[PDB]
């Protein structure tokens, strides 16, 4: 948010800086140092399946997405622990043709046995936010059902 | 409702923080109530006859900060004055006022949440007919729940919880136990023991659970008026096993002090 | 680079203070980490059926101050409810929310330096099938480096460092030493002594440097099942001198507790 | 004159709070002087050759908050470098500057009330010819008046007030008393007692008032090189009463340690 004189927390004007406690206008913080760290992958309505292209960072560290509910707790997580850095993990939650393949170059690797079976509790994603575990970049395609349209 | 404060407002109106809101925040940070203060003298206050001028003294009363810059306080002749900080929020121009009172009239009124005038003593001034005789500042209380600390230095003293116990071991033996901080216990020997053998358990009452040690504690005592000694094994189950020489029908006075750790 | 905050901005733009910077500042002033809180009920919370209404409670979590003003949390029946403050900075309009959970799910997430939701438990509310039976607050931890204090009162207990050492002193004598606060030592005698004379150094292991006293310490012991006693001297060099009577080939069981200060 | 700060400004001009006013306020809350700091390494600093980079370290020096974000400071080869935080308010563009020095050159300049440059050491970097060998940070002293705590955990040690006294009891007895926290006292027996009867008082000096216990403490001793023992009664009035065997003209060496509580 933009910095405003009298409204923001700053010691300005006549030396050695002055910030006033007013009623309603008082002092409101401008923003946060390095606000570029905050990124929310927002989930507003219940989603069923998705086709994400996961770009992993570190090898041998569980890489994959986890899902947070409205209170900041985890219900489901698709997490894989690979031996080498995959160029991208392709995950599809579609019931009919599930795909969990780690691509490296032109080679496609099946990631099903390497996956955490206990963390992956449900396919149905609820209202909250998605967190990226050991990922540099992410590209998602969300499919959400509607009974009558 | 949840009123958020230490959070940025993008439209610069969302989360405004007031004097009372920060006042309550500061009180929690230092661990103070409306009955105690945070006071620091940057320059010693001058004493001119029956008057006390605070050259440069900063005070945090009820989480509200204020500086006293060459502020003189009138004193009562030949009396023990109590200097109070009076905060009346209704006085928008001058909320803080000072007063020298007969007795400590600290009210502890919650000003940050409710209405009223907050009175709190910070300095005690003892005076004579002419001028100031002696000055004593009010202790700055820091109420805390738990402390994780590397090192500590105490200039006064520490008040640890004390527990007393008087168990009649039997055969004529009396023990006076004093447990401090649930660890160190000093056993005081009393009475006169009779009809007991070596390695035999003592007939009377057993040691209570809060005073029982983790391992068997061998505590040495002495027979009054003699050069003969004894020792009793306080086992973890509370049982007191005699380990001195075999004593007949004649009772001999037993006295002594023995220290042991429970933990 | 150096980022300055508590400094004057000549053109009102140089040093803006962010909510994360104040968060870190406040955490440092009070000595709190992301796994604790500062909490104050200015007025008592009210229990109505399976609900707790926080009437006026202030909380500091991750250095962020907020107020619960008539904020009701719904509870699970016949359960131990762990009340959490949840901070999500991405939820710009409502960054703080409360939850009643089945376990203490405090996560210690650094919200002032990185991304994520901070969850911190502050209250434990136990219910029956109809309402609240008991409430217990979570401890407010103060993590400090070094304290210089005048007086302190402890209602619970102080946990100080403890070191133990078993010494095979020689001639069958065994010492079990327990040192607390690196100062107070309680020596427990074990084993059985034979073939020693008064004034003679015991033939075994010397006391390790961390248990050595600054001055010679005479510790009284007792012979199990006898009227006789002895004493040993723990010398500042770690050696142990026998000061009982001369002992012949037959071993005599040695017991008793003796205390000394290292400092 | 009274300068109010944590208060509402009706016309938005009444109570302006400055950097020095908040600076003094923050100092009083944490309990710090101009000679100590509040430092926290959010991310461990990196050591590359004869240089130390502070990745993310927040420091509160003289109540002034600042962050070191990847700020590298040059070091001296094979030397003990004392890293200082230098605050100069006249340097309005960049008030905080870092410096690696030969010795701890902390000045304790009152920057909030007066003028000058504040210097304060926070880190001690020991180096070699190539790089860094070891790093030891400066202690964070939290100066407090009174503490009202429930529980405590110490990783180092607590310094309590220690008082020592040497009483020449009489008949050939010497008592070395060591009082810690004005409560626990360990008495050491010295000298050679001669010409005394059982139940009779001591001829020489009496125990001083600060070392006098609340009740009569029976302290057990031992005769050097013998299998005979003794015990003395230190009454609350300061009097010492012998309770061992009757001693004839020949003096026998008396040694031993006996502990008791005053309160």
From Swiss-Prot, chains B, C, D:
Pfam families listed in its UniProt record: Caudo_bapla_N, Caudo_bapla_RBP, Caudo_bapla_RBP_neck
GO-annotated cellular components: virus tail, baseplate
Region (Host receptor binding): 163-263
Keyword Nucleus appears in the UniProt entry: no
CDD domains on file: RBP-H (cd07964)
Location in or out of the cell: Virion
Entry-linked InterPro entries: Adenovirus_pIV-like_att, Caudo_bapla_N, Caudo_bapla_RBP, Caudo_bapla_RBP_neck
Keyword annotations of the record: Host-virus interaction, Viral attachment to host cell, Viral attachment to host entry receptor, Viral baseplate protein, Viral tail protein, Virion, Virus entry into host cell
Cited SUPFAM superfamilies: Bacteriophage trimeric proteins domain, Phage fibre proteins, Virus attachment protein globular domain
An individual GO BP term: cell adhesion
Quaternary data: Homotrimer; found as an assembly of 6 homotrimers. Interacts with host phosphopolysaccharides; this allows the virus to bind the external cell wall layer. Interacts with the distal tail protein.
Family: Belongs to the skunalikevirus receptor binding protein family.
Domain note: The C-terminus is involved in host receptor binding. Host-recognition domains point upwards, towards the capsid.
Function summary: Binds to the host phosphopolysaccharides at the onset of infection. Upon activation by calcium, the receptor binding proteins change their conformation, presenting their binding sites to the host, and a channel opens at the bottom of the baseplate for DNA ejection.
Protein name (database record): Receptor binding protein
The gene coding this protein: rbp
């Amino acid at each position: 948010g933009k910095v405003i004189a009298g409204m923001s927390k700053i010691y300005g004007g006549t030396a050695p800086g002055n910030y006033k406690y007013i009623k309603g206008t008082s002092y409101t913080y401008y923003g946060e140092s390095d606000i570029d760290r905050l990124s929310r992958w927002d989930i507003k309505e219940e989603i069923f399946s998705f086709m994400g292209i996961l770009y992993p960072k570190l090898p041998k560290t569980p890489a994959g997405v986890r899902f947070l509910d409205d209170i900041g707790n985890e219900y489901t997580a698709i997490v894989f622990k690979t031996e080498q850095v995959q160029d991208y993990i392709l995950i599809n939650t579609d019931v009919n043709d599930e795909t969990y393949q780690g691509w490296k170059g032109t080679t496609a690797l099946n990631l099903f046995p390497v996956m955490d079976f206990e963390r992956y509790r449900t396919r149905i994603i609820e209202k909250g936010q998605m967190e990226l575990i050991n990922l540099s970049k992410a590209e998602f395609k969300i499919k959400r059902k509607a009974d009558f349209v | 409702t949840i009123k958020n404060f230490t959070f940025f407002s993008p439209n610069s109106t969302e989360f405004p923080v007031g004097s009372n809101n920060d006042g309550k925040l500061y009180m929690m940070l230092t661990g103070m109530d409306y009955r105690t203060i945070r006071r620091k003298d940057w320059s010693s206050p001058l004493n001119t006859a029956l008057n006390v001028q605070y050259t440069n003294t900063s005070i945090i009363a009820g989480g509200r900060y204020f500086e006293l810059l060459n502020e003189t306080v009138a004193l009562k002749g030949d009396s023990v004055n109590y200097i109070h900080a009076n905060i009346d929020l209704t006085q928008t121009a001058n909320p803080v006022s000072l007063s020298a009172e007969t007795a400590n009239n600290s009210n502890g009124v919650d000003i940050n949440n409710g209405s009223g005038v907050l009175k709190v003593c910070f300095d005690i001034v003892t005076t004579s007919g002419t001028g100031v005789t002696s000055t004593k500042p009010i202790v700055q209380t820091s109420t805390l729940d738990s402390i994780s600390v590397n090192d500590m230095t105490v200039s006064g003293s520490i008040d640890v919880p004390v527990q007393t116990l008087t168990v009649e071991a039997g055969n004529g033996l009396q023990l006076q136990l004093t447990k401090k901080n649930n660890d160190l216990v000093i056993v005081r020997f009393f009475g006169s023991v009779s009809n007991i053998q070596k390695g035999w358990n003592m007939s009377g009452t057993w040691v209570d659970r809060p005073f029982r040690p983790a391992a068997v504690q061998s505590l040495v005592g002495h027979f009054a008026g003699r050069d003969t000694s004894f020792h009793i094994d306080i086992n973890p189950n509370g049982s007191i096993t005699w380990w001195g020489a075999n004593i007949d029908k004649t009772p001999i006075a037993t006295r002594g002090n023995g220290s042991y750790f429970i933990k």
